[PDB]
Amino acid sequence: EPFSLSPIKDPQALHKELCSKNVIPVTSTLEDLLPATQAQHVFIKRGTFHSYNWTIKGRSLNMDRLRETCQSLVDRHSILRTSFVEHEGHPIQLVLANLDVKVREVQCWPGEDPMEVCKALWDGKDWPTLNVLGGSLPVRFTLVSCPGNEHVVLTIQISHSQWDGVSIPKLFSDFAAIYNQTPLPPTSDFAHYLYHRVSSAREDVQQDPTFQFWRHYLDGAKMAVPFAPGQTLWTFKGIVPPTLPSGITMATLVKAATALFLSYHLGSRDVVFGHTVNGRNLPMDNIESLLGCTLNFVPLRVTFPEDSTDWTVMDLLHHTQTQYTRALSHEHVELRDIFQHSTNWPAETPLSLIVQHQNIDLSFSLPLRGLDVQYSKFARFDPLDEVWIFTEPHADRLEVQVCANSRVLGQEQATELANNISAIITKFSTDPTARLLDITF
Numbered sequence: 001e002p003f004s005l006s007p008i009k010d011p012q013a014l015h016k017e018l019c020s021k022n023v024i025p026v027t028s029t030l031e032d033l034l035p036a037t038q039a040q041h042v043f044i045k046r047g048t049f050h051s052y053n054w055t056i057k058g059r060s061l062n063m064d065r066l067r068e069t070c071q072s073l074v075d076r077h078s079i080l081r082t083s084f085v086e087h088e089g090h091p092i093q094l095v096l097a098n099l100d101v102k103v104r105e106v107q108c109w110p111g112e113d114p115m116e117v118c119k120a121l122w123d124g125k126d127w128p129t130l131n132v133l134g135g136s137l138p139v140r141f142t143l144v145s146c147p148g149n150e151h152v153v154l155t156i157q158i159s160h161s162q163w164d165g166v167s168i169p170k171l172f173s174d175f176a177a178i179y180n181q182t183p184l185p186p187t188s189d190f191a192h193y194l195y196h197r198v199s200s201a202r203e204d205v206q207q208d209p210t211f212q213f214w215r216h217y218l219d220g221a222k223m224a225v226p227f228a229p230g231q232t233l234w235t236f237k238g239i240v241p242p243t244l245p246s247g248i249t250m251a252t253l254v255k256a257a258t259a260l261f262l263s264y265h266l267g268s269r270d271v272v273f274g275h276t277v278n279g280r281n282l283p284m285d286n287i288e289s290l291l292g293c294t295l296n297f298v299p300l301r302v303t304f305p306e307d308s309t310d311w312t313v314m315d316l317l318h319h320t321q322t323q324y325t326r327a328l329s330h331e332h333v334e335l336r337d338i339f340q341h342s343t344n345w346p347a348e349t350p351l352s353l354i355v356q357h358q359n360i361d362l363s364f365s366l367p368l369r370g371l372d373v374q375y376s377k378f379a380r381f382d383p384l385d386e387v388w389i390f391t392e393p394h395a396d397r398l399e400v401q402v403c404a405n406s407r408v409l410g411q412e413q414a415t416e417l418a419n420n421i422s423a424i425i426t427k428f429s430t431d432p433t434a435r436l437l438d439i440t441f
């Protein structure tokens, strides 16, 4: 029920106070006001900002319905109508209604490439002036036309606190839908997800199944704490896709490689690092389809036996995977809650390393009809104190991607990390029965 989780005492006072400052349309009505998730704050603090671009060539294109769809798409999904301000220190998200979407449009000189115009607006003003926490609505649309409207670029701009890998194909789905004027099953929105989390919590916080699970799961764990800390480095390594042992997910293989690597350099038989879970394992409907950012970043814990036990790669793989699936029904809570209620660590403890495998959709489609549609994007992402390892399963390649600021992880160290991890994954694939101690890297 609307406003039941607002930290602000009079929400709509804050609303028109923004309307007055010309931040948000004065025609807009304040629907709800909830706090932002820790994961949301994570992305906003890192300037995670996206422009999904579609190059539409063909004789059909209805520019006016293209414009309609943008209004409609935004009407459907409350999160696309969300504005972020930070009053007191942690962010709140204000949801908007009665809000009509205006599209930025560009008619190019003859011969002027539309994508280049987009790139220019992007680097020129779009992202260098970005100030999501200021309240300006982050979702916004651009339409760049060749002289005759038969070569056009459509770009959606969005903050990662508003989408995830699970639901972003749904944004392109529901968009291509509305243009083709095709039925859509009603959807939930992201605020309803937040509500649904609060209810399935408990009266007593240490009576909660979930904060009881985490306390049991992290009993005796120690997190390694990096040393003293520039620019953002992306370091890549591609390999042959691993041949998975039966029962073993690709993300399991990846997360176990990381554990092995950490155990070796940390000289520890018990390691804890962060990984990304999709956060959609709640008993609610449309949770498969509702648009928003349900991703969470939670401890993955991997514990190795004493050397006498003489474990193999397969032991490690099976252990590592249940150390993930054990958490499925508990993976939706705030990280700070897990640390506050279930551990002795400061509630504001960061994850220093986050492994994120996307067994999600790497390819995107915007199927519009009477039309050649290409996909492409621009993206900003700028890590703080932490190191990211992203893995993507392509046809030709599994791609390991390390992302960290160079003040944290220099190119040589970033290169070695990507290489070493990739090599471990390959060895795991090769002889899944190898003794762990016969492993070199």
Ligand SMILES: [Cl-]
Pocket: 048, 381
């Ligand atoms: Cl990202």
